[PDB]
Tab-separated table of C-alpha atoms and ligand atoms in Angstrom:
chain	number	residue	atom	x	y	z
U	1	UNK	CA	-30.871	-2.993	7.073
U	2	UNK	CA	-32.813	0.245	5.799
U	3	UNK	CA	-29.655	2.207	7.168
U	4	UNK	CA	-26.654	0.935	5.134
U	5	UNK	CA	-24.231	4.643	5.765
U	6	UNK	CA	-24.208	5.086	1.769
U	7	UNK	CA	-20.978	3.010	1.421
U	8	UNK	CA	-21.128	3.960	-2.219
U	9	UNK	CA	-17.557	2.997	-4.255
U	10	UNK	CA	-17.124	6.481	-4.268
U	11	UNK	CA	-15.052	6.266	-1.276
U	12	UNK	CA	-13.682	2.517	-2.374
U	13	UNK	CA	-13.138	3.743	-5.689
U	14	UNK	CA	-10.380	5.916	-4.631
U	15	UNK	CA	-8.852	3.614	-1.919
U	16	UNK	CA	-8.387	1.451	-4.726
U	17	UNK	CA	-6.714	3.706	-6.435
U	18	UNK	CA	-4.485	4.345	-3.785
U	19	UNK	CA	-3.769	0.551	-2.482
U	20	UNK	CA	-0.962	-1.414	-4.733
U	21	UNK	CA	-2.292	-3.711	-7.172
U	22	UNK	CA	-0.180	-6.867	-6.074
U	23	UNK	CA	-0.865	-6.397	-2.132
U	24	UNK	CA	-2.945	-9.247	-0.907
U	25	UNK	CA	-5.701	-8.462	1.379
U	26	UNK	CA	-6.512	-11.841	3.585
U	27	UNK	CA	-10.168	-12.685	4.119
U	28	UNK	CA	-11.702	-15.273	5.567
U	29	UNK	CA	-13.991	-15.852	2.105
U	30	UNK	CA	-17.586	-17.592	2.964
U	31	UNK	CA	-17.401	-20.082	-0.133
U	32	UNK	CA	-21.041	-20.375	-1.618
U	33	UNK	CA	-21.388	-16.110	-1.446
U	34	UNK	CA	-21.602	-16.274	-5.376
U	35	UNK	CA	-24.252	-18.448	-5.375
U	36	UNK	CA	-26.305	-18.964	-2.170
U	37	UNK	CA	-29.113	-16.860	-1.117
U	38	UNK	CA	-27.456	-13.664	0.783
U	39	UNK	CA	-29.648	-15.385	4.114
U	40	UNK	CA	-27.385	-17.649	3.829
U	41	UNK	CA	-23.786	-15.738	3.889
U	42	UNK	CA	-24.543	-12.585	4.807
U	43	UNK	CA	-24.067	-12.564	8.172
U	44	UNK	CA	-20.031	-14.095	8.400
U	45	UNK	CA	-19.173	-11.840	5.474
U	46	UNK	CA	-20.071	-8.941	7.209
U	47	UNK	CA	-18.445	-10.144	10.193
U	48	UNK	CA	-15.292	-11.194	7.941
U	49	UNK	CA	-15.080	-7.834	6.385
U	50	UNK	CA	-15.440	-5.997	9.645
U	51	UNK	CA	-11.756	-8.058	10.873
U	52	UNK	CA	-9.981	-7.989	7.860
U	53	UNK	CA	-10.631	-4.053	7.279
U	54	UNK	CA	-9.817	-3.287	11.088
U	55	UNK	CA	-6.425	-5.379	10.681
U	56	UNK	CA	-5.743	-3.887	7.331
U	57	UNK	CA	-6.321	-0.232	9.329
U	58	UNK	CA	-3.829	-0.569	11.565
U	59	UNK	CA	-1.261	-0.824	8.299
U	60	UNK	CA	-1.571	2.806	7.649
U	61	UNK	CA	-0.829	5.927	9.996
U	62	UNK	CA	-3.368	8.526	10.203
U	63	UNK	CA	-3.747	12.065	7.893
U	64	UNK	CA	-7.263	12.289	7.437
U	65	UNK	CA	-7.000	15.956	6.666
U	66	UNK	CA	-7.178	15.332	2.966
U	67	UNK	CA	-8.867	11.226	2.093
U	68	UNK	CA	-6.216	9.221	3.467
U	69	UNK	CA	-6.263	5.563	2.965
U	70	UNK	CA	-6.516	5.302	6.775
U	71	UNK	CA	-9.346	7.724	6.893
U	72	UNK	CA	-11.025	6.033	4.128
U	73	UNK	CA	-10.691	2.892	5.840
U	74	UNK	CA	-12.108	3.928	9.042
U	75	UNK	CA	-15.051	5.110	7.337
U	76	UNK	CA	-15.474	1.597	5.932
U	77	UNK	CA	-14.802	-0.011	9.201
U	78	UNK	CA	-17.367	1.588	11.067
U	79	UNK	CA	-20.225	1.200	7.991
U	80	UNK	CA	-19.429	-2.516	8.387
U	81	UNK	CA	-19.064	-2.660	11.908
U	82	UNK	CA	-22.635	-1.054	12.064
U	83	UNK	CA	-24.100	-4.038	10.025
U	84	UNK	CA	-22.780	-6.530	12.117
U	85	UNK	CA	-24.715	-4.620	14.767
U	86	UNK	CA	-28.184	-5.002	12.610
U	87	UNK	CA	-27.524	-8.768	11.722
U	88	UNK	CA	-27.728	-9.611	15.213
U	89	UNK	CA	-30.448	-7.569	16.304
U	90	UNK	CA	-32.171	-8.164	13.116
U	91	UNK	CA	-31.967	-11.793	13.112
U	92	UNK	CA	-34.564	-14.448	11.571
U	93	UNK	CA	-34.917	-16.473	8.407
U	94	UNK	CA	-31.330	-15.048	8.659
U	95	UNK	CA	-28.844	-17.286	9.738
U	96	UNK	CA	-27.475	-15.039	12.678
U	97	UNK	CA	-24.202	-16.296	13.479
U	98	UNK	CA	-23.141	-19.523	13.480
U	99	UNK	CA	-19.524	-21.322	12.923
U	100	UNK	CA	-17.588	-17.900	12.388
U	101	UNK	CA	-14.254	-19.843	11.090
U	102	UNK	CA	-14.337	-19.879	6.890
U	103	UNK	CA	-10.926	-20.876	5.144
U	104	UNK	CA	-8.910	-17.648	5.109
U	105	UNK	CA	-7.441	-16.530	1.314
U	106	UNK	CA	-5.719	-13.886	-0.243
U	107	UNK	CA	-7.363	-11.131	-2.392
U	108	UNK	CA	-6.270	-7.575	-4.555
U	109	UNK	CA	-7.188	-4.755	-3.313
U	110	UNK	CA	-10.173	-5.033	-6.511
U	111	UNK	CA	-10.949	-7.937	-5.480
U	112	UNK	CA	-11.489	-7.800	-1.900
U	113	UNK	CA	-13.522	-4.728	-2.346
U	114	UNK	CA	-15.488	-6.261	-4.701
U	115	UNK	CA	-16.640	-8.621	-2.335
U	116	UNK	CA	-16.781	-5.801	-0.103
U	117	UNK	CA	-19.454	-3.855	-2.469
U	118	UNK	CA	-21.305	-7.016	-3.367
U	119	UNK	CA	-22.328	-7.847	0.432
U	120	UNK	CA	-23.274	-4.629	1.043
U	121	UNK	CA	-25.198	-4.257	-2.071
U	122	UNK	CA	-26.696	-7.367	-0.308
U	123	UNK	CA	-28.667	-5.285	1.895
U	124	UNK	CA	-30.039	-2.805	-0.267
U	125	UNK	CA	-31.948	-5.610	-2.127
U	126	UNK	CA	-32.650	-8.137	0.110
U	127	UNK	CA	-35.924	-9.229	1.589
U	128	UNK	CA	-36.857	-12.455	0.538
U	129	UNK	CA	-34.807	-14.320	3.301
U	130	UNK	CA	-35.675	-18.320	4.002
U	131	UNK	CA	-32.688	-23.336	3.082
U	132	UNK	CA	-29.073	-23.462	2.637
U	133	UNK	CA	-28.069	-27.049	2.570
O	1	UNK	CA	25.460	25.122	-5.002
O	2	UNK	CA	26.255	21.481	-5.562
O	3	UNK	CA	24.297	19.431	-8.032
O	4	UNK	CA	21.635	21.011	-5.927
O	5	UNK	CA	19.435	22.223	-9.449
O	6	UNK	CA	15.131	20.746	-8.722
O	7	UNK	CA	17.407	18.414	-6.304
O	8	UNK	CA	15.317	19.663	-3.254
O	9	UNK	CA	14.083	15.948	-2.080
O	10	UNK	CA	11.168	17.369	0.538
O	11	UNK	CA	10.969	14.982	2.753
O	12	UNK	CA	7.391	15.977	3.789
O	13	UNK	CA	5.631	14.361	0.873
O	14	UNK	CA	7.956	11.174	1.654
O	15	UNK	CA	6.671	10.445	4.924
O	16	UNK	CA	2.908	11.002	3.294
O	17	UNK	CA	3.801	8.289	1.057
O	18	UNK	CA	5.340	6.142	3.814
O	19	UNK	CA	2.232	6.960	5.817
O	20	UNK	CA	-0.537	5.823	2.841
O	21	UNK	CA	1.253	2.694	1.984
O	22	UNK	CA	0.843	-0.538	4.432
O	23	UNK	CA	3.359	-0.994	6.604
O	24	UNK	CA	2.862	-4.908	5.392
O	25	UNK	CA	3.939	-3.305	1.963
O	26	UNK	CA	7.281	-5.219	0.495
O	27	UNK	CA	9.385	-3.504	-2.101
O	28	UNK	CA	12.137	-4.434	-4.140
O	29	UNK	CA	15.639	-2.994	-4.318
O	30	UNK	CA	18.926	-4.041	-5.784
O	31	UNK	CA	20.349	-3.102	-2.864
O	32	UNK	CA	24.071	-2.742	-2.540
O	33	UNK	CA	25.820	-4.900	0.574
O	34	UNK	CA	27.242	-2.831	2.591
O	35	UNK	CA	26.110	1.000	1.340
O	36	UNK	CA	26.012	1.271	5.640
O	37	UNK	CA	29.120	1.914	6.405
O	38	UNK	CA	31.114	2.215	3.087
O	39	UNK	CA	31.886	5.922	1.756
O	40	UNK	CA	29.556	6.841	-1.299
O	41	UNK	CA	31.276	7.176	-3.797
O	42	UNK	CA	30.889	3.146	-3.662
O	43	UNK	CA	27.172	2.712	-3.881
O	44	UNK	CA	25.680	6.253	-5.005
O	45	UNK	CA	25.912	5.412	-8.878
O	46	UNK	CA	24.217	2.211	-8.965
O	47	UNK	CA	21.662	3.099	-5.801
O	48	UNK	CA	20.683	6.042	-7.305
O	49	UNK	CA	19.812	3.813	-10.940
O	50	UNK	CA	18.078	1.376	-8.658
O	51	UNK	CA	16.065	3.206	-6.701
O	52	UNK	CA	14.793	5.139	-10.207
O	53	UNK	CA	13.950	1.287	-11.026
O	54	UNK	CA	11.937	0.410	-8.126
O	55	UNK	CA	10.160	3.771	-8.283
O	56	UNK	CA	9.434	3.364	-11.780
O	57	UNK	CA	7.996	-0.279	-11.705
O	58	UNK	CA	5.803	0.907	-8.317
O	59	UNK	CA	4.021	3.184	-10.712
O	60	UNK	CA	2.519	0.306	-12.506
O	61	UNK	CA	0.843	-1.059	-9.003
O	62	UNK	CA	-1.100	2.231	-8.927
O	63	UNK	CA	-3.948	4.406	-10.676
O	64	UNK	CA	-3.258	7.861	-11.646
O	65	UNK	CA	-7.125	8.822	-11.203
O	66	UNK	CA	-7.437	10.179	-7.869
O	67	UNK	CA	-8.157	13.609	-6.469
O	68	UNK	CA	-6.190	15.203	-3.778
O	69	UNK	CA	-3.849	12.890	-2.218
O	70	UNK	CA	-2.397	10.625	-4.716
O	71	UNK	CA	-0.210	8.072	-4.203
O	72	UNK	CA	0.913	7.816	-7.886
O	73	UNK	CA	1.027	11.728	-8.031
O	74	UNK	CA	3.988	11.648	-5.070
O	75	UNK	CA	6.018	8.555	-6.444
O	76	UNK	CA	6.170	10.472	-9.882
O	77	UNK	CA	7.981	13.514	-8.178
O	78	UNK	CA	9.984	11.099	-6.358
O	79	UNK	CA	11.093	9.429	-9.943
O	80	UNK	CA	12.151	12.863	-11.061
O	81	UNK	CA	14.334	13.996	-8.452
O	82	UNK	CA	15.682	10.836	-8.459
O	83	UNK	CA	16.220	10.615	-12.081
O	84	UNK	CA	17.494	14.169	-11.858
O	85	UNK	CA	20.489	12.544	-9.817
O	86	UNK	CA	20.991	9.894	-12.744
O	87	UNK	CA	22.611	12.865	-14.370
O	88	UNK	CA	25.227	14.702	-12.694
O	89	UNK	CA	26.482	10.861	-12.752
O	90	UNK	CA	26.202	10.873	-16.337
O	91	UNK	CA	28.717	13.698	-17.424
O	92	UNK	CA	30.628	13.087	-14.609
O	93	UNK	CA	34.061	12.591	-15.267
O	94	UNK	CA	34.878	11.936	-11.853
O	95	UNK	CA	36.589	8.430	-11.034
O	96	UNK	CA	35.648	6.899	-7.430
O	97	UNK	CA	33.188	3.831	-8.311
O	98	UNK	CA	30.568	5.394	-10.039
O	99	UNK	CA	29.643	1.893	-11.599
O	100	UNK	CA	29.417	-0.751	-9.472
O	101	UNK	CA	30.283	-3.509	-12.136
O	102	UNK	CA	26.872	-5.237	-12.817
O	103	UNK	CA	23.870	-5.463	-10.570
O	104	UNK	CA	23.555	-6.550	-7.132
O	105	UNK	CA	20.949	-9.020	-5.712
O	106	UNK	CA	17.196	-8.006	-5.243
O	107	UNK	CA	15.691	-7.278	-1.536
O	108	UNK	CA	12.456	-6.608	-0.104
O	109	UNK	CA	11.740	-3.487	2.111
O	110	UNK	CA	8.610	-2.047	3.550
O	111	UNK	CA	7.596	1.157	2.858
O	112	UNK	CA	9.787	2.847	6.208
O	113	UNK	CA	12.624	1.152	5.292
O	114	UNK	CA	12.855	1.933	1.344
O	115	UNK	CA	12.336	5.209	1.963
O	116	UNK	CA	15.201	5.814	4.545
O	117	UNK	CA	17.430	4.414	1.694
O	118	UNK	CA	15.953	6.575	-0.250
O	119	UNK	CA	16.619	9.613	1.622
O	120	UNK	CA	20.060	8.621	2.469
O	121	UNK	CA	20.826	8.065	-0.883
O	122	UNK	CA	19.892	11.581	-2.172
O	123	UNK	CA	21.201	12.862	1.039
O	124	UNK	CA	24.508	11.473	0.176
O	125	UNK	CA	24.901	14.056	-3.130
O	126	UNK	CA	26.508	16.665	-0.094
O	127	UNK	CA	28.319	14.192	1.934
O	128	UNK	CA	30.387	13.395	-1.408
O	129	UNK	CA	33.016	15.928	-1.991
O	130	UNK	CA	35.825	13.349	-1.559
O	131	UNK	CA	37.250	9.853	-3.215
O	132	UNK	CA	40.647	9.537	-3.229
O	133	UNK	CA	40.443	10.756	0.658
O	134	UNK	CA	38.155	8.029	1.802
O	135	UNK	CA	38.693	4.013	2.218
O	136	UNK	CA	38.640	0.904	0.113
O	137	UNK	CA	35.103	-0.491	-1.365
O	138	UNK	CA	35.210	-3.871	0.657
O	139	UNK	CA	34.398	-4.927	4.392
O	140	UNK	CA	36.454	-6.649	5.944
G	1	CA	CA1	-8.878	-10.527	13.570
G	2	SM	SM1	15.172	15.089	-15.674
G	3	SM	SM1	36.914	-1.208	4.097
């Protein structure tokens, strides 16, 4: 999706920084994302990441006068949010939806935004779309 | 001025903290029974050494590479007014119950309620001009 909001790790980077190393993030994890074809898992991890950022906003109160983690969040919520939008509208050799209900795990903060960078990173270089078994 | 030397806690960089940690956030405290409703000169010595613990070790869960608001930058001022307290309980030569025999059993918080021990706790080095004037150490 051309338009990805720059969602760069500058901003992750420091939420990271900022999130304790032994809270677990939950996320409903698309297995197959480490190997498939983005086509293939694209679509529910954006939609996965979308819910488990705009739960894990409502943990923090607001501040954003200085690069809160709630700020911060927001920010990442909306960029996400925004590529659900596309994946919808954008839909073909794409699998648009379907199922929405992955097994649900537990992740650090590193790795959940790891994830998080990976399937947006998806975009950027993705164009080859379509099988995925 | 009592014990009052860097002991100006600042309350506003507490609820900051309290504010940029997840309310889902559990912490652990050797937490003393009954610190409530008990007078504190039987729970100040070993709260105050147990908070500086649980401080300390939250250190480790964070990164110390971050510009303006830090999350590691405000717990390490927190550690040193708090560790500033471990002191006047050092010298002192003052028998109430600074000690508290051993250590008591380990509890989980979020970040609101830490914190409000917290305060409390270093809130309690005015409240404590008395010992011999106050009650036992038990409930019951
Ligand atoms: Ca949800
Ligand atoms: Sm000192
Ligand atoms: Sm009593």
């Amino acid at each position: 999706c051309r338009n990805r909001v720059t969602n760069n790790v500058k901003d992750v980077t420091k939420l990271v920084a900022n999130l304790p190393k032994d809270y677990m993030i939950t996320l409903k994890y698309v297995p197959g994302m480490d190997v498939l074809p983005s086509h293939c898992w694209i679509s529910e991890m954006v939609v996965q990441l979308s819910d488990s950022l705009t739960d894990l906003l409502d943990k923090f109160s607001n501040i954003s006068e200085g690069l809160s983690n709630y700020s911060i969040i927001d920010k990442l919520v909306n960029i996400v949010d925004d590529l659900v939008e596309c994946v919808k509208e954008n839909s073909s050799k794409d699998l648009k939806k379907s199922f929405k209900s992955p097994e649900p795990r537990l992740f650090t903060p590193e790795e959940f935004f790891r994830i998080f960078n990976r399937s947006i990173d998806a975009f950027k270089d993705f164009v080859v779309a379509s099988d995925c078994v």
